[PDB]
Amino acid sequence: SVPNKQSSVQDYPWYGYDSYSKGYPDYSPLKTYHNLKVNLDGSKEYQAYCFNLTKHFPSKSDSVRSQWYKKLEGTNENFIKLADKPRIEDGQLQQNILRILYNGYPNDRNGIMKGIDPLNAILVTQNAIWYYTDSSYISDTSKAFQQEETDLKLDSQQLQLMRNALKRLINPKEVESLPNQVPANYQLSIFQSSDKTFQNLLSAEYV
Amino acid sequence: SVPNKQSSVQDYPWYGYDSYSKGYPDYSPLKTYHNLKVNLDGSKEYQAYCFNLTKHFPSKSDSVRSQWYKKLEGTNENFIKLADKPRIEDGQLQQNILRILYNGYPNDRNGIMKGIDPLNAILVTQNAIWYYTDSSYISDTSKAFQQEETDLKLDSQQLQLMRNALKRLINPKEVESLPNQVPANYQLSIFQSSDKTFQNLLSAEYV
Numbered sequence: 001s002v003p004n005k006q007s008s009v010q011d012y013p014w015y016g017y018d019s020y021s022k023g024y025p026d027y028s029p030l031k032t033y034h035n036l037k038v039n040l041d042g043s044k045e046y047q048a049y050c051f052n053l054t055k056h057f058p059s060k061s062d063s064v065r066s067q068w069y070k071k072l073e074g075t076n077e078n079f080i081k082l083a084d085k086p087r088i089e090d091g092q093l094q095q096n097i098l099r100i101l102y103n104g105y106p107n108d109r110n111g112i113m114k115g116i117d118p119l120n121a122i123l124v125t126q127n128a129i130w131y132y133t134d135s136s137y138i139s140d141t142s143k144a145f146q147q148e149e150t151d152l153k154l155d156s157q158q159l160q161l162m163r164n165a166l167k168r169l170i171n172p173k174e175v176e177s178l179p180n181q182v183p184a185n186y187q188l189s190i191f192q193s194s195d196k197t198f199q200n201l202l203s204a205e206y207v
Numbered sequence: 208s209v210p211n212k213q214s215s216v217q218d219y220p221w222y223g224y225d226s227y228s229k230g231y232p233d234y235s236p237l238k239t240y241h242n243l244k245v246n247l248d249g250s251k252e253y254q255a256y257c258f259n260l261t262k263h264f265p266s267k268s269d270s271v272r273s274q275w276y277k278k279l280e281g282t283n284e285n286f287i288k289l290a291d292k293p294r295i296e297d298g299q300l301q302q303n304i305l306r307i308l309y310n311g312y313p314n315d316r317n318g319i320m321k322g323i324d325p326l327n328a329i330l331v332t333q334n335a336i337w338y339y340t341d342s343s344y345i346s347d348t349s350k351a352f353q354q355e356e357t358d359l360k361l362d363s364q365q366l367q368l369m370r371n372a373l374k375r376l377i378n379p380k381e382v383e384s385l386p387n388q389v390p391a392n393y394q395l396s397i398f399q400s401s402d403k404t405f406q407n408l409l410s411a412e413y414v
């Protein structure tokens with residue numbers, strides 16, 4: 001069921017939470033999976049991804065604690081204002097993030113995520129997002145998800161697909177060579193956390 | 208007061224927690240400070256620093272949830288086994304971390320932390336630790352702590368001392384070219400979290 005929580009914070013009406021919680025299919029509290037969502041007073045849930053690695057993850061949906069968010073335009077200016085270490089040397093941060101969301105979970109318009117289990121696909125997408133929003137270190141994708149392999153007990157098939165999908169998502173030249181490019185109507189939103197101790201969120205949708 | 212919590216997990220007797228909680232002097236729940244500690248059944252608290260930026264921070268001391276830890280030798284092999292993205296290029300990972308702990312808060316053996324307020328000194332040390340444990344991006348220290356400046360309301364004096372200390376701590380040349388070198392009896396310990404969803408910890412002491 002979709003949560004219906006009304007904000008107690010002026011200008012922060014969006015409820016941001018982790019849906020990988022009790023009630024989620026195959027949920028385990030020992031697994032490092034996440035499934036971040038944003039919704040407004042029990043409305044349609046939007047797939048969300050976090051940024052600010054040194055801040056707290058949004059609380060699980062069954063927690064007594066709730067985090068409130070303000071929806072902003074997903075511009076470069078708003079990322080510079082809210083991100084700790086954005087990868088802005090390519091100068092198309094916003095565009096890179098939009099391309100990842102368009103090609104990642106669940107949109108997957110060019111089939112980069114094909115064969116990857118939903119929670120593993122979210123994990124790949126999130127890692128590609130962190131590469132841009134927090135300048136997270138990714139040198140060799142062939143060596144990626146080593147901790148996740150032991151923590152989540154990923155089989156060789158899933159692990160190889162995940163490594164290849166991450167490689168493709170963080171390479172702009174690779175994404176730009178694909179048949180389906182990001183249209184003007186597919187737009188980025190930044191969700192600013194009311195509580196500065198919690199991570200900010202980001203989401204994309206067709207307008 | 209020093210917490211006294213007994214583990215129920217075989218081989219994980221250490222209690223690891225964030226002491227920056229209700230009751231700590233000048234505590235604010237809106238500040239991004241941390242003061243991580245490890246202790247054994249109410250014994251002396253040891254200053255701890257976290258790693259694994261994508262995992263959960265240890266819970267605050269006043270939480271119903273407790274995280275349990277196994278004390279391991281602070282070797283390069285144990286870092287490769289538990290860290291997501293360690294900065295191993297120079298093969299001196301363990302020595303680099305030891306040098307940071309020896310020179311950082313509270314040890315400060317070469318006075319690098321002089322004039323920096325305790326929570327700010329922990330913050331500088333933690334950021335220097337993350338640079339090695341998680342390959343966190345630090346290009347120009349002159350620009351460091353921009354989000355912390357607004358979130359923690361740091362004055363110009365503290366901010367300048369913090370930026371200079373970070374620069375010195377992450378430069379292997381600098382620290383090795385200091386009058387006091389890390390002695391053989393100052394040893395590194397890795398605290399392995401029983402719950403794989405939580406950050407691992409690290410601490411150093413004189414043996």
Ligand SMILES: [Cl-]
Nearest residue numbers: 056057263264
């Ligand atoms: Cl967290």
